[PDB]
Every structure is written in C-alpha cells, then in structure tokens.
Amino acid sequence: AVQARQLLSGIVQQQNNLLRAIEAQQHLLQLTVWGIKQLQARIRGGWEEWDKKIEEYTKKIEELIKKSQNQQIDL
Amino acid sequence: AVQARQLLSGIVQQQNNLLRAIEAQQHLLQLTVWGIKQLQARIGGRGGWEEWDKKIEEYTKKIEELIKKSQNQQIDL
Amino acid sequence: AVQARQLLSGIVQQQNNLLRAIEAQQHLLQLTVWGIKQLQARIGGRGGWEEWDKKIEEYTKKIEELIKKSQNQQIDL
C-alpha cells in the first residue's frame, strides 16, 4: 500500500520528466530545421518532399505531445 | 483494485504515447542529418567530418536498437 | 501481487529504455547543432543568429537538467 503508492507516484513523476524532455527536444529540433532551411535558401527546389515529411512528423509529434499533456497526472 | 487498474493502464497508455513521439522525433532527426550532409556536400568535400559521421551512425544505431527494444516490451492494455 | 510486480517492473524497465533513447537523441541533436553552426560559419558571419543561439542554449540546458533529474529518479528492479 505505502509501497505501491510510492512506486506508482515515482513512476508517474518520471513520466512527467520524460515528457518535458521530449517537448524541449522538439523545440530544439524545430530550431535546427529552421537553420537548415535558411542555409538551403542562401544557396529550395527539390526539397519539396523533404519539407513535406518534416511537416508530417512535426504535426504528429505535436499531436502526440498534446495527447500526452492531457494524459499526464501530477500526483 | 479498480483504482490500481485505471492508474496502471493510464501509465501504460502514457508510455506508448511517449514512445511514439520518440520514434517520430527520430524520423525527424534523420531528415535533419541528411539536410546537413547535403549542405556539406554542396560546399573540399565532406572530408574532416568522418568522425562526426561516425558518432551519428553510433547514436542512430543505439536509438534504433532502444526503440525496437521498447516496441517488444510495450503492451497495449 | 505477482501480477502487479511483473507489471510494475515491466513499466519501470520501459521507462529506462525511453530515457536512454532520449539521451541518445540528445547526443544526436547536439551533433546536428554543431553541423549547422559550422555551415553558418562557412558561408557575413554568424551575426543575426544570436537569438537563435540563445534559445538552443536555453533548451539544451533544460534538457540536460531534465535528463539528469530523470537518471536520479530512475530505478533498476
């Protein structure tokens, strides 16, 4: 009882740590994407599909993140 | 009992969402790697980046291993 | 009882896998940051990317803090 409570709370707490890390990593990722796009632009045709997949994965990540924020509990 | 199941399942669901996000972030990261690599090629060659290339291969392999590892461990309650 | 332990241990092992993947992705991410910065420096100066650099740093430190914070909370059953 006291055991299981401390265990599950600890588990729940680290889930919030992992999620917060994932969100920060995503913010970092979007910054790198911008940097690349700006470099391709200083030297963007032929990168249409590349742009599309990025948008695809980015949308999915943002969806999953939002879906995780609501699933999240702070015990 | 009812409390335990709901709390546990909720935790299991949360983990599957975190994993899915990690996978999509990995797919996203590999796209940026290529993007950089193609820029480096467009500007002596890609010489001097052999070690850089190495660590990427190292971490990429490790991530993919850990992901597959997490897929086989993951449960869909 | 036997059910709960096996289920809770499985969950904890999964968290360990997810965390390790996040650390490896972070290593990979920092490699991409370097690659970009070196291309920016090889093509006026890196002026105008001050704010960009600052946010990279901001999120990077936050990630590393969150990672270390998760390594402590981490248990191996």
Residue numbers in the entry:
A (entry chain B): 538 to 580, 625 to 656
B (entry chain C), C (entry chain A): 538 to 580, 623 to 656
Article passage:
HIV entry into a host cell requires a critical membrane fusion process mediated by HIV envelope glycoprotein (Env) transmembrane subunit gp41, a direct target of HIV fusion inhibitors that are usually adopted to treat the AIDS patients without response to other antiretroviral therapeutics. These CHR-like peptidic inhibitors in helical form are capable to specifically bind to the homotrimeric gp41 N-terminal heptad repeat (NHR), interfering the formation of a NHR-CHR six-helix bundle (6-HB), which has been proved to be the key step leading to the virus and cell membrane fusion. Finally, by introducing an innovative C-terminal tail of Ile-Asp-Leu (IDL), we succeeded to increase the anti-HIV potency of a CHR-derived peptide (Trp628~Gln653, named CP) by more than 100-fold.
Therefore, we further determined the crystal structure of N43-L6-CP-IDL, where N43 (Val539~Leu581) is 7-residue longer at N-terminus than N36, and contains whole target of NTHP. The hydrophilic aspartic acid residue in IDL tail also forms an interaction with NHR by contributing its side chain oxygen atom to form a salt bridge (3.2 Å) with the side chain nitrogen atom of Asn553. As a consequence, in the structure of N43-L6-CP-IDL, binding of one CP-IDL leads to a buried surface area of 1115~1159 Å2, where IDL hook-like tail contributes 158~165 Å2 (approximately 13.9~14.4%), larger than the contribution of helical IDL tails in the structure of N36-L6-CP-IDL.
